[PDB]
Amino acid sequence: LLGTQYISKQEYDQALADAQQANAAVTAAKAAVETARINLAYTKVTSPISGRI
Amino acid sequence: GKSNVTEGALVQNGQATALATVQQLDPIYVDVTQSSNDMMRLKQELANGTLKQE
């Protein structure tokens, strides 16, 4: 729509924000998955050191 | 100082054993054990009198 009629630079910006805004939440949850995963496959091995157990 | 922990050893936040010991030796403190009754006479004398100081 940009350059076309209805776009209403404000409104497109409104969604583009929503784009901007939503994806940020996307980044947010991804960590949530991340924090969990590192809390799930976290278990267990082991002391980053590789040695006689 | 030394390391209370080697690499890989798990730790918690503000946990009981600090990991390493920083220190500053340029100045230093000496705690002087003084007989309780003693220092009495000290001011006891320093007003006694006499005694004096520097």
Swiss-Prot record, chain B:
It comes from the Bacteria. It is found in: Cell inner membrane. Belongs to the membrane fusion protein (MFP) (TC 8.A.1) family. Monomeric in solution. Homotrimeric; interacts independently with AcrB and TolC as well as AcrZ. Part of the AcrA-AcrB-TolC efflux pump. AcrA-AcrB-AcrZ-TolC is a drug efflux protein complex with broad substrate specificity that uses the proton motive force to export substrates. This subunit may act as an adapter protein that links AcrB and TolC stably together. This is Multidrug efflux pump subunit AcrA. It comes from Escherichia coli O157:H7.
